[PDB]
Design a protein around this ligand. Structure first.
Ligand SMILES: Cc1nc2c3ccccc3nc(SCc3nc4ccccc4[nH]3)n2n1
Ligand SMILES: [Mg+2]
Ligand SMILES: [Zn+2]
Length: 314
């Protein structure tokens, strides 16, 4: 972290980091510094102790595993998308929420092992015994708290108890909301609330639901990057799906299709289903509630039609 304290973002990145489509991929060595930058620009220079923050960042980094998709790179990619969301909707959120949500995005897949929640449930993994729903997402939070409580890592030490436990709740909720199994209910409710005009960000329950959708929107943002970056990040995703499907084949169990590397002809069609069923819906409702996030929906549509071109060989 010594080098991270005296790190500085190049003036070129200062312009582009603000854009939704910005792709962090090409700047691996700057990722921790990019996150520090984003926290300062959104939450200020004065709230986090530079040293404790930098140490926390590198311990978060160290506790992400080298797996195809749910890795350090993905953590920072999800943090960035949130930054741009926060930056375009700044005063709709409180200072404590932005503190908690940026950290939550960075920490939201800590210690991911490359296995889904169903895998862990089906094979009675210890973690499935402690956590019976949103198994990994509950582990990811518990992992966040564990780092926070390390010597010198408590970046929320300068908060009151009330505020500390407030930001842990923003965080816990936000990390749990990245369990995609919860998203579908969340989105349909948010859609109904918006369509009836009942939605109210001063209503806490509503407010938690918007934040949840923001986290989903952030988790999936590889579908809002430029086509070639999107393509590339799809390799990473299915690489991890197939790795897991393989582990089932070793146990003589045919995996679901998206985790079966012998069924990869079905990928183009699988992406079509995912954009129609999951991704487009997400950014559509998000754009209704936070209009300045439309470019996410715009880029998502662009990429859907790209997967449409592929299906008919073009
Ligand atoms: C680019 C991408 N990102 C994801 C993803 C991200 C988080 C959780 C699941 C994800 N699944 C996929 S593709 C497999 C899939 N196809 C579906 C169709 C309908 C509903 C869920 C689906 N998941 N993809 N594809
Ligand atoms: Mg996750
Ligand atoms: Zn994630």
């Amino acid at each position: 972290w010594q080098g991270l304290m005296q790190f500085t973002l190049p003036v070129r990145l200062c312009k582009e980091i603000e854009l939704f489509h910005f792709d962090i991929g090409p700047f691996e060595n700057m990722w921790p510094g990019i996150f520090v930058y984003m926290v300062h620009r959104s939450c200020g220079t004065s709230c986090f102790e530079l040293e404790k923050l930098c140490r926390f960042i590198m311990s978060v980094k160290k506790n992400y595993r080298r797996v195809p998709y749910h890795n350090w790179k993905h953590a920072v990619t999800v943090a960035h998308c949130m930054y741009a969301i926060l930056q375009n909707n700044h005063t709709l959120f409180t200072d404590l929420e932005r503190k908690g949500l940026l950290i939550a995005c960075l920490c939201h897949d800590l210690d991911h092992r490359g296995f889904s929640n169903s895998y862990l449930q089906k094979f009675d993994h210890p973690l499935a015994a402690l956590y019976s729903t949103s198994t990994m997402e509950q582990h990811h939070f518990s992992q966040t708290v564990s780092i926070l409580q390390l010597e010198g890592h408590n970046i929320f030490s300068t908060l009151s108890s009330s505020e500390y436990e407030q930001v842990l709740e923003i965080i816990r909720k936000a990390i749990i909301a990245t369990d995609l199994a919860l998203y579908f209910g969340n989105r349909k409710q948010l859609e109904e609330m918006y369509q009836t005009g009942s939605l109210n960000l001063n209503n806490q329950s509503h407010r938690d639901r918007v934040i949840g959708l923001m986290m989903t929107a952030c988790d999936l943002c590889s579908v809002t990057k430029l086509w070639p970056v999107t393509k590339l990040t799809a390799n990473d995703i299915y690489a991890e799906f197939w790795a897991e499907g393989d582990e089932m084949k070793k146990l003589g169990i045919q995996p679901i299709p998206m985790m079966d590397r012998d069924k990869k002809d079905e990928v183009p069609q699988g992406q079509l289903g995912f954009y129609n069923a999951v991704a487009i819906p997400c950014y559509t409702t998000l754009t209704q509630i936070l209009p300045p996030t439309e470019p996410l929906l715009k880029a998502c549509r662009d990429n859907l039609s790209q997967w449409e071109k592929v299906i008919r060989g073009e």
